């Protein structure tokens, strides 16, 4: 089983609702795949796509919904207090999760930001919050005002996270060990004065790790200016650009590496 691959949570809250955003919302991730979604308007933790066929214990989803309702409260409250002491509008975010140590225990993560900058951390092995700015005090003090908060935060991170991760590697093995290989295409178009641009594009693959190498007359030539993006259904899409001298195109090939392929795959114009 893919021992230890990260389980991570993304959390946010905002004061300005002029573009129709929820006041609080969260997403959860196993490595690169998102397995959960949640917002204050539905108050339910629902599985994402493929994760709905996973054999889980009868109480799996009820328990995720509970932990998330707790967080929602601590976040929405932090905003009102900030609104009271300082003029403006605010955006609050958090990053929380874990990864498995070889003996199977936890190595956690917990950080926070206010209006685009990191302003606070939380060490679960001590139960304390830290910072360096005036708003750290306002927020940290508000959260300390009920000791259980800190205690339940250390447990989510050092106990629940690793048990969830460990159950996912097993019950969700088919999902994690999938290698849908990429579908390839290579094309050329006009560039700047006297130049041409080649674009190697990769469709529908999983996992997201893929390597590009361009070849001029069968010899390694660089990897080009590359990028990746989500594909709307579980798989990914990527592309790399290379500038060549006009008239020079037919000398190049594109080659990619991927865990879903038995050996590299050479592509032709």
């Amino acid at each position: 089983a893919e021992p230890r691959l990260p389980l991570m949570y993304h959390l946010a809250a905002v004061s300005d609702l002029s573009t129709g955003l929820p006041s609080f919302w969260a997403t959860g991730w196993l490595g690169a795949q998102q397995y959960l979604t949640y917002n204050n308007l539905r108050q339910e933790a629902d599985p994402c796509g493929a994760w709905i066929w996973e054999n889980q214990v009868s109480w799996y989803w009820e328990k995720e919904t509970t932990d998330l309702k707790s967080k929602e409260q601590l976040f929405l409250e932090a905003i009102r207090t900030l609104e009271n002491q300082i003029n403006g509008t605010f955006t609050l975010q958090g990053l929380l999760g874990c990864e498995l140590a070889p003996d199977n225990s936890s190595l956690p993560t917990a950080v926070f930001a206010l209006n685009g900058e990191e302003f606070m951390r939380f060490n679960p092995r001590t139960g304390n919050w830290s910072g360096e700015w005036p708003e750290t005090d306002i927020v940290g003090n508000l959260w300390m005002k009920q000791p259980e908060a800190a205690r339940k935060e250390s447990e989510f991170l050092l106990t629940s996270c690793p048990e969830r991760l460990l159950g996912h590697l097993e019950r969700g093995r088919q999902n994690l060990e999938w290698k849908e290989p990429p579908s390839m295409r290579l094309k050329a178009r006009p560039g700047n004065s006297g130049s041409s641009v080649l674009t190697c594009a990769a469709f529908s693959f999983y996992p997201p790790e893929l390597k590009f190498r361009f070849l001029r007359n069968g010899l390694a030539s660089g990897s080009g200016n590359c990028s990746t993006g989500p594909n709307g259904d579980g798989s990914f899409h990527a592309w790399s650009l290379l500038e060549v001298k006009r008239g020079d195109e037919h000398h190049y090939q594109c080659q990619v590496e991927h865990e879903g392929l038995a050996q590299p795959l050479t592509v032709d114009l």
Partner: protein, 205 residues
């Protein structure tokens, strides 16, 4: 002439705020208004990096200002904010570097001082906060009533003490009644060498 101002300390401190490095040139001239602002951060040119020059028409000459917005993190980690002004009536690119201090910071001493008894013969009294022994001069004091902003204050400029430190006073004028009713007042000081760049000290009857 090209002046270059820092972000307000509060605004680099608070993630809820937005820090700006303002390059104020006063002159440029007519026939040569074409002042190409150049903004560099550490080494690298930032293009715009949301640089925003807005033209003013003053004196007998032009007052031109471009405002580079800064990442809180970068300025706190002290990058160099280099403003450069071009033109053709101008033989050389007028260069200007700012960043913060680089150090050695001294933590301010915030004591709050009640009105004098002789001043309770007035029916407006004054509340005083002494903030001393800080460095650099870059500080920000504010006042609150009970828990909420008081707009009724005057802060003196940081003035250098015998110490080689800076000091200031800030004077909250409240109503004699408003003090006598045992109402809580507070001065809220923001400086680099404070606990989270922030502290607060309370005046109550």
């Amino acid at each position: 002439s090209v002046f270059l101002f820092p972000p307000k300390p509060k605004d680099t401190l608070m993630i809820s705020r937005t820090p700006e490095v303002t390059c104020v040139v006063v002159d440029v001239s007519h026939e040569d208004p074409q002042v190409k602002f150049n903004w560099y951060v550490d080494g690298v040119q930032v293009h715009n990096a949301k640089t925003k020059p807005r033209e003013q028409q003053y004196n007998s000459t032009y007052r031109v200002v471009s405002v580079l917005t800064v990442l809180h993190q970068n300025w706190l980690d002290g990058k160099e904010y280099k403003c450069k002004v071009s033109n053709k009536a101008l033989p050389a690119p007028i260069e200007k570097t700012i960043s913060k201090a680089k150090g050695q910071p001294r933590e301010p001493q915030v004591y709050t001082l009640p009105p004098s008894r002789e001043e309770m013969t007035k029916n407006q009294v004054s509340l005083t906060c002494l903030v001393k022994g800080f460095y650099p001069s870059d500080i920000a004091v504010e006042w609150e009533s009970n828990g909420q902003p008081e707009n009724n204050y005057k802060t003196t400029p940081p003035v250098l003490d015998s110490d080689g430190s800076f000091f200031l006073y800030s004077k909250l004028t409240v109503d004699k009644s408003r003090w006598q009713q045992g109402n809580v007042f507070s001065c809220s000081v923001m400086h680099e060498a404070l606990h989270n760049h922030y502290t607060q000290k309370s005046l109550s009857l």
